[PDB]
Amino acid sequence: YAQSSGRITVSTKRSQQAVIPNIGYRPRIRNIPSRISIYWTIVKPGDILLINSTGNLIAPRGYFKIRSGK
Amino acid sequence: YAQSSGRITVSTKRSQQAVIPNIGYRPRIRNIPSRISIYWTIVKPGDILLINSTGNLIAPRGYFKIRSGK
Amino acid sequence: PHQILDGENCTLIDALLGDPQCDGFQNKKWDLFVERSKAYSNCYPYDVPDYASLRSLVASSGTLEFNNES
Numbered sequence: 686y687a688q689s690s691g692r693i694t695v696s697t698k699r700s701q702q703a704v705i706p707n708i709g710y711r712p713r714i715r716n717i718p719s720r721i722s723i724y725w726t727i728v729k730p731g732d733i734l735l736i737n738s739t740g741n742l743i744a745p746r747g748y749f750k751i752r753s754g755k
Numbered sequence: 756y757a758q759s760s761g762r763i764t765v766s767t768k769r770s771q772q773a774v775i776p777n778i779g780y781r782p783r784i785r786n787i788p789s790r791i792s793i794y795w796t797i798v799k800p801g802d803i804l805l806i807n808s809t810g811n812l813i814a815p816r817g818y819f820k821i822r823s824g825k
Numbered sequence: 826p827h828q829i830l831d832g833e834n835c836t837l838i839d840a841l842l843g844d845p846q847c848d849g850f851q852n853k854k855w856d857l858f859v860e861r862s863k864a865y866s867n868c869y870p871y872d873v874p875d876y877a878s879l880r881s882l883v884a885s886s887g888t889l890e891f892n893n894e895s
C-alpha cells in the first residue's frame with residue numbers, strides 16, 4: 686500500500702466507522718500469516734455512502750439487497 | 756520500554772486481540788498514576804497462542820485450565 | 826414449504842463474501858440457511874469483529890442477491 690500505516694473511514698449521514706489496520710504476526714492459516722477484518726455498512730434511502738482509505742482497504746464490489754422477512 | 760509507543764498483538768488461530776497503550780495521567784491509587792488493563796485469551800486444543808509485542812506488555816506465566824461445571 | 830438452502834461445506838459468511846468453493850450460492854434466496862458442521866474455509870483467512878451480529882443480519886435479510894456498483 687506504499688505507506689507505513691493505512692486508515693479507513695467508511696461513513697454515512699447516520700453512522701461512522703473508522704478502522705485502523707494492526708500490522709503483526711498471526712498463526713499461519715493456509716500458509717497465510719495475515720488476517721482480514723470484515724465490516725458492514727447499511728445505507729438507507731436518501732443516505733450517502735462515503736469511503737476514505739489511505740491504505741489497507743478490501744473494497745466492496747457492490748451492495749447486498751438487505752430486506753425483512755421470515 | 757525503550758520505545759515511544761507499544762503495540763501488543765496476542766492472536767490465535769481463530770481470534771486476534773491488538774491493543775495500544777494509552778499514555779497519560781490518571782488519579783492516583785496507592786500512589787500510582789498508572790493503570791494496567793487486563794485482557795484474556797482462550798486457546799483451544801490444536802490452536803497456537805502467538806504473543807508478539809514491541810512494548811508495554813504484562814506477560815503471562817501460564818494457563819489457568821478453564822472447564823465446564825457447576 | 827420453506828425455501829431451504831443447503832450448507833454443502835459452506836458458511837453463510839463465506840457465501841456472503843464469495844468463497845470459490847461457495848460460488849454456487851451467488852444471488853440465491855432462502856428461507857432457512859442450514860449450516861453444516863463439516864463447513865470450512867478455503868480462501869484468505871478472515872476474522873469478523875461481530876460475527877454473530879453479521880450472520881444474524883444476513884440470515885434475517887434472507888437473500889444473497891448482489892448488484893455490482895461502478
Ligand SMILES: *[C@@H]1O[C@H](CO)[C@@H](O[C@@H]2O[C@H](CO)[C@@H](O[C@@H]3O[C@H](CO[C@H]4O[C@H](CO)[C@@H](O)[C@H](O)[C@@H]4O)[C@@H](O)[C@H](O[C@H]4O[C@H](CO)[C@@H](O)[C@H](O)[C@@H]4O)[C@@H]3O)[C@H](O)[C@H]2NC(C)=O)[C@H](O)[C@H]1NC(C)=O
Nearest residue numbers: 776777778779780781782783784785786787788789790791
Ligand atoms: C496532572 O494532574 C493530576 C491531577 O490529578 C496530578 O496528579 C496529582 O499530583 C499530585 C502531585 O504529585 C499528587 O500529590 C501527591 O500525593 C501523594 C499521595 O498522597 C497521599 O499520601 C501522603 C503520604 O505519602 C498523605 O500525606 C496524603 O494525605 C495522601 O494520603 C503524596 O505522597 C505526594 O507528596 C509528595 O509531595 C509533597 C510536597 O507536596 C512532599 O512533601 C512529599 O514528601 C512527597 O514528595 C503528593 O502530595 C496527587 O496525588 C496526584 N493525584 C491527584 C488525584 O491529585 C498530576 O501531578 C498532574 N501532572 C502534571 C504533569 O501536572
Ligand SMILES: *[C@@H]1O[C@H](CO)[C@@H](O)[C@H](O)[C@H]1NC(C)=O
Nearest residue numbers: 832833834835846863864865
Ligand atoms: C465439500 O463439498 C463438496 C460438494 O458438496 C464435495 O465435493 C467436497 O468433497 C467437500 N469437501 C471435502 C473436503 O470433503
